[PDB]
A paper describes a structure:
To achieve this, mutations are targeted at the sites of binding of potent mAbs, most of which bind either on or in close proximity to the ACE2 interacting surface of the RBD and are exemplified by the Fab/RBD structures we present for four representative mAbs.
BA.4/5-1 (IGHV4-39) is an RBD binding antibody that, according to the visual analogy of the RBD to a human torso, attaches at the back of the RBD, with the HC binding at the top of the neck and the LC at the back of the left shoulder, making a large footprint of 1310 Å2 (HC 670 Å2 and LC 640 Å2). This antibody heavily overlaps the ACE2 binding site; of the 35 RBD residues in the BA.4/5-1 footprint, 20 overlap with the ACE2 footprint. In line with this, a large number of mutation sites in the Omicron variants have either direct contact with or are on the footprint of BA.4/5-1, including 405, 408, 417, 476, 477, 484, 486, 490, 493-494, 498, 501 and 505, but interestingly most of these mutations have little or no effect on the neutralization potency of BA.4/5-1, which maintains quite broad cross-reactivity. RBD residues L455, F456, Y489 and Q493 make extensive hydrophobic interactions (≤4 Å) with CDR-H3, while F486, G476 and S477 contact CDR-L3 of BA.4/5-1. F486 also makes ring-stacking contacts with Y35 and Y60 from the framework regions of the HC. Mutation of residue F486 has been observed in recently identified SARS CoV-2 variants: F486V in BA.4/5 and BQ.1, F486S in BA.2.75.2 and XBB and F486P in BA.2.10.4 and XBB.1.5. BS.1 contains the unique mutation G476S compared to the other variants tested in Fig. 2a, G476 has close contact with Y92 of CDR-L3 and the change to Ser likely disrupts this interaction. However, all four Fabs have close contact with residues 455 and 456 and the L455F and F456L double “FLip” mutations, present in some of the recent fastest spreading variants, knock out all of them.
Residue numbers in the entry:
A (entry chain L): 1 to 213
B (entry chain F): 1 to 212
C (entry chain R): 334 to 527
D (entry chain H): 1 to 133, 138 to 220
E (entry chain E): 1 to 134, 142 to 221
Amino acid sequence: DIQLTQSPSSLSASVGDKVTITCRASQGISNSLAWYQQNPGKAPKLLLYTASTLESGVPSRFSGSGSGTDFTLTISSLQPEDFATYYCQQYYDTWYTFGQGTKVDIKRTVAAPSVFIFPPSDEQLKSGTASVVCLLNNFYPREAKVQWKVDNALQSGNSQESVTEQDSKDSTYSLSSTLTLSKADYEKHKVYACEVTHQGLSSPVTKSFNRGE
Amino acid sequence: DIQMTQSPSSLSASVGDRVTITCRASQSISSYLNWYQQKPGKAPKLLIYAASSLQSGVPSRFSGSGSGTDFTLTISSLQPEDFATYYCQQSYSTLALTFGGGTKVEIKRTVAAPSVFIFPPSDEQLKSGTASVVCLLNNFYPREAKVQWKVDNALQSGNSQESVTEQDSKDSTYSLSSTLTLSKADYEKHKVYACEVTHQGLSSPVTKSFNR
Amino acid sequence: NLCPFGEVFNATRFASVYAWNRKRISNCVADYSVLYNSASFSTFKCYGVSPTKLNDLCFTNVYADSFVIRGDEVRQIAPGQTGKIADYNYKLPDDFTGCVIAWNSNNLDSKVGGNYNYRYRLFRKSNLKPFERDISTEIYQAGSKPCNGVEGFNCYFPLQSYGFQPTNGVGYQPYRVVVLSFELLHAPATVCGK
Amino acid sequence: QVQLQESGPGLVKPSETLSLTCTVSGGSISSSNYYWGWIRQPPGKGLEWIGSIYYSGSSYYSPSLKSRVTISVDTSKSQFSLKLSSVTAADTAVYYCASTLGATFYWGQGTLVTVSSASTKGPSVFPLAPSSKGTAALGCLVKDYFPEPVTVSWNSGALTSGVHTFPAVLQSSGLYSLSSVVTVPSSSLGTQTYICNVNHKPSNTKVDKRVEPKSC
Amino acid sequence: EVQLVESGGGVVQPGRSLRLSCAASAFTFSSYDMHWVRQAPGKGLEWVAVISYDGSNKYYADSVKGRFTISRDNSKNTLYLQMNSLRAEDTAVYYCAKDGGKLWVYYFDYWGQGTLVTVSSASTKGPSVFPLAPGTAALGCLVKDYFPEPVTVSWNSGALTSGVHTFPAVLQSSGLYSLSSVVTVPSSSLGTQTYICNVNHKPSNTKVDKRVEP
Ligand SMILES: *[C@@H]1O[C@H](CO)[C@@H](O)[C@H](O)[C@H]1NC(C)=O
């Protein structure tokens, strides 16, 4: 079963730059490969097939190369409408396979997040559930780690993250992590923190509160 | 369309040097590549047509060569009147004639440090509602210079305009003027007004200021 | 007598791009300036010669190639171009000496239910050489195992319908093209413009 | 231009059968060297091929789903259909219909199908009060609702600068949870009233929540 | 000895029309093809259109097709370019060029001096000149808020030539132009030597002389 592996998982570049995405297959697939572009929320659009042939209507800045197991998609001069996620697919065997996708990102300067923590409201604690939210406001790049610590115990598998689309003005992201506990499990502890590690932070930042203060 | 890429974008040389400009085509244009010279403010003048044919009246020091996708214009002995911008243009696509970006031939001089002066907005202007902070870079070489506006140590991005003169007829130097334009409301909001200069003939960012 | 350009430009039906028609024009006098200036042409680009200069030049033969493509593919009928049409259907040499004429033909070649009679070669192992015409319908192998006529998942019919509907965007609408090739051999010329 | 329009319910209870129909209006489903397939895309995940079908030739399925998948073709009505049996929350994905061949050349707009057994529930809106410890942040938590979507504005649209309304996450309870935040100057917390406007039309729920700093 | 003289350039609002001319001399004008080539401020050259020797054939670039019209009057030896529906992207210096004619393809062997076409809606406003008060020293004048190009700035009625640097204008966000002109003088003759910058704006007929003192 052919396996497609794309490189890199995420790429950040600027307008006019030359961009190269790589796609590799677990088996030899000759030239039977196609490239696709998908803007957020819209359906995918075919760019190339047979590794090298541009679909009619596709701008000429797109180009492809390769055969066998190694393939390359290249945008000569990146334009603002080209920022999206890119997939590769083989049509060599029967069970068709896609790559995991390469999201092309806008390169701006590194921006550190503004970290905010929110205790559960007294109105929600009356329902039996407690939701502690951690906010990372206006940062770049997207790669950021949110670590929940309850009484200095690192939490996992009871939290969920959510990231905003990159802002059209300042080109930053924003993340919200929601740690969910029962009311009974909430009142068992005192210190609730969320440690944030980011490239624009020389050291991890921790916003915390003590329950009932 | 057929794109024409010239290299280098700018070159500096002296009288008597041998100058060669390169012109690349996105696709084959056979021998239909023409070279032109344009002075600042003047009309272009034809030098070479059909890649290698010399136009009548053009000095023999000009010569052109090439075929397919790579072309070259060559000035054997550069003369003082030859400093200008040179364009290549393809005529293979006769109904879609395209020009190159151009190669500006400049006078090679030694590195010159700029003299930085700052001027406040006059009292006559502030009553109209606009405030313009001006920074000057005087007599420097080469052209590449970065002027960074810092107001209260905050980089003023998206709020100024630059302008550069041509090479001076005496010392072959440039001059740059950056005009930071803000409203009077934005003017009294801050205190520090600085102008940072980065240049090849310098070593550290230079800042000129004054107090109201 | 005059050269029959009308039989090409005014032809009621055009050929599909993979099976492009070629009309050899010889031993006649040709009228060009009055013929071309009509502006009823959305696309009109010449390579290696001026359209006003043709009334002076003589050629051994003149070739009028004609076919139909879609709007987004008109940019491919040119020297040095790549893509599905220029690589697999109709290719001009890198030193092409002639003109490319195209006009929107939505009123002629699109139907309300869609016109699928216009086809094009989608898959081909190697690019076409300039002025090559491939009308082969052999099943294309796109996997490992050969096809031997059997069609399926690594075995594709090499031609594909256009499907021209009058309501499609201009990029998906049919365009009729005429490519005039001007050949100059070391032989006595027979086609002169006048 | 080949036009693909897909239809079908975007909500299917678990263990039930997902069913979708793609109508073709760009090319005769019979008179084109075009295979007719289905590709799905789980939220935030990659693309997965489901299966394809020919006008008569044969069908071809993804072996990982072949036991649960049936693709049929209707020519009198120019439609090819998809049926996924015993759906689970794993099958919550955007489903596309595609004119496939070597590549998938044309693509339907895509129908999001959510697999859940939850009925319609109006959300609970809890305040994210700004804490004490130059710019401060506050917001609202729109928790435990179904189905999508909700809309959140601030000050009835008078506050737009600095607002981040995050996409909803699907909780383990089968209910969605969503947060909307805004950064404001710390000096306005005592003088400016902040209210988030949550609107959940599936349940006819409109809630205005005033967000105030927490008193000791 | 081939001469080409243009005329008809100036200011024009978006969507309006303007017509250019090109009087030729000292060559058989009714035998050569003719061209138009424009050049945006600070940019490169762009071929616009071409017309045959007899004027029966016309071919245009895609950026001006269905918008410009080329024509010629062989009895008057003049070339015309009717520019309708002018956009701001059409703001450029327009040259006319004679075709060389020695090849099967087009090429320009002689060019006209060129005329400027500034496409913008802003009315012709006069400049507001502000001084710039000052190991040597420097001082100058600030010509701000004027439309359109250009303005000529001199010092002491053209007597002060050495040490002057007049900068190219910049199109600010207000649709007007701003220009800077400076001059470096020895710091000794400051209160003894008087400096007056001469600003003239022919499109608005404004001549402003301003004194410059520390
Ligand atoms: C094409 O047909 C029109 C009439 O429909 C005719 O006037 C024209 O001369 C024809 N063109 C040629 C090249 O014969």
